[PDB]
Amino acid sequence: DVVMTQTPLSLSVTPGEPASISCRSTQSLLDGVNPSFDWYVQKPGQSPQLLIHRGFYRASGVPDRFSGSGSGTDFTLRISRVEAEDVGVYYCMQRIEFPLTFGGGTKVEIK
Amino acid sequence: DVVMTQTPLSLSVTPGEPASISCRSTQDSDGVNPSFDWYVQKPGQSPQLLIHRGFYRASGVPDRFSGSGSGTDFTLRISRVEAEDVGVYYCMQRIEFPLTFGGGTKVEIK
Amino acid sequence: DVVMTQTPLSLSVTPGEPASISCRSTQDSDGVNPSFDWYVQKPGQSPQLLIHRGFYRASGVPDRFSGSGSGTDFTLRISRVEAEDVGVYYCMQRIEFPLTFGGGTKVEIK
Amino acid sequence: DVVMTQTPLSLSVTPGEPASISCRSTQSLLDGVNPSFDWYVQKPGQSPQLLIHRGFYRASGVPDRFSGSGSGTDFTLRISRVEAEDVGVYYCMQRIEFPLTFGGGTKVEIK
C-alpha cells in the first residue's frame, strides 16, 4: 500500500562532523493528497523526542544543529555538527492528511 | 475525489416532531476508515460542532440529538425539534490514516 | 472554546475587480499551532477546498486565488473576480498537536 | 504540558500466560477535547507495527490475541496468551484531536 524507506539504517559519525538521514515514501500520489514527515529520536531513559515537524520546523528546546528539508515524498534530517549526546535511534514518520469533504447542507426550519 | 450526498435539502418541521438527516459518502477504500461529523450553523452564529465521529455529542448538545450508521452511511436524528434547533445542518467526512514509520537509524559514535 | 471572525459578511464585486476576505482566530496557545483552510460553496454544489494551510491552492484552483497571513490572522485574495467565483466562502481553523509517546515496554521472555 | 506514563517499562512473561500494558495521560481535560491512544510494537528487522488503533480496534493481520480497552486518559493493551514471537518494545501513542472551528462565511456575489 505505502512503503517508507529510511536511509541509512546505521550511522557512525565523529563529533563535529555533519550527519544526514533521508526518508522516502511510496504513497501513490493522487487527489493521499498531502504527506508530511516528522522526525523523532529515541534515547534510553527518555520517552521518544520530537525533533522536526512537517519537514521543516524544529521543536522548542531542540538544539539548532537540527534542521530538515525536502519535497514530495523525499525528506532529510540534517545535523550540522554531531555532538556525543546525539547517539540514539532516529525515526521518520509519515502523516497522510486528507482535507475534509462536506455535504451540501440541510436547512432546518420550524413552523 | 470523494462526493457526499446529504438528504433532504430542507426541512420544515412542526415543533415537537422528530427530524432525520442522512449523509452518504462515495469513498483505496481499504487503507481508509472514514469518520462523520455533524455541524449546525444557526442564524447569527458561526458553525458549531454537533456530533463527532458518528455517535458522540459535543459539549452542551441536548440529548435530543443522536447519530447512527456505519461505513459511509450515517444519520442524524432530532427526537423533538425545538425552536432553538433552527439552522443549516452539515455532515463532514474526515479520512484518517494511521501513521507509517521508517525503520530505525541507529546513530552511534565511533 | 475558540471563536473565528470572518470579515466582511458579504461581497458585491464588479467583474474583473479584486476581492479580499479576512479571518481571525481567538486561540494554551503555545502547545498549539493553528492552520487555516478556505472552502467555497458554489450554488448547486457541496463545499470544496480552496486553500489549504494558509497558502496552498487545491487541485484545479485558479492562480487568481492566493492566501497570506500568520499566527491566527489569515487572508484570502481573489485577484480578478469572475462569474464562476460566486459563492459563500468559509475559513476553517485546524488545531494540530504533535503526538506524544510513552516510554518503551520491553517485553522479554524468561 | 501533557505527560504520558506507560506501565510497566519491562515485562517478563511465559508463553501461554496473559500480559497487559497500561498507558495513562495527564492532558488537562477541557473543551485537548478528545484523546485517542494507539499501540505499536517495534521488533528488530521490521519497521514499527501498528497493533491497536484508537483504544479498541485491531489492525488487519494482527493476531487476535491482541486487544485494547479503556476510557478517558487510561488505556490498556492486552495479550490473552503471549507467544514467543511477541518479544519486542511496545509503545502507546496519544493523539489529541480538536474539532474544527469555522468562520461565519462570506457571500461573494457579482454584478
Numbering used by the authors:
A (entry chain A), D (entry chain A): 1 to 27, 27A, 27B, 27C, 27D, 28 to 107
B (entry chain B), C (entry chain B): 1 to 27, 27D, 27E, 27F, 28 to 107
Manuscript excerpt for this entry:
Overexpression of antibody light chains in small plasma cell clones can lead to misfolding and aggregation. In this study, we present an antibody light chain that maintains an equilibrium between its monomeric and tetrameric states. According to data from X-ray crystallography, thermodynamic and kinetic measurements, as well as theoretical studies, this antibody light chain engages in 3D domain swapping within its variable region. Here, a pair of domain-swapped dimers creates a tetramer through hydrophobic interactions, facilitating the revelation of the domain-swapped structure.
We also remove the constant region from #4C214A to obtain the variable region (#4VL), which forms a 3D-DS dimer. In the asymmetric unit of the #4VL crystal, two independent #4VL molecules form a single 3D-DS dimer. A pair of these 3D-DS dimers constitutes a tetramer. Within the 3D-DS dimer, the β-strand located in the C-terminal region (Leu96–Lys107) is exchanged between the protomers. When comparing the crystal structure of the 3D-DS dimer protomer to the #4VL model structure, produced using AlphaFold232, the hinge region is identified as residues Arg91–Pro95, which is a part of the complementarity-determining region 3 (CDR3). Interestingly, the N-terminal residues of CDR3 (Met89, Gln90, Arg91, Ile92, and Glu93) at the hinge region form a β-strand structure that interacts with a portion of CDR1 (Asn30, Pro31, Ser32, Phe33, and Asp34), which also forms a β-strand structure. Clusters of aromatic residues were identified between the dimers, indicating that aromatic interactions significantly contribute to the stabilization of the tetramer structure. The cluster composed of Tyr36, Pro44, Tyr87, and Phe98 forms a small cavity. Moreover, 13 hydrogen bonds were observed at the interface between the 3D-DS dimers.
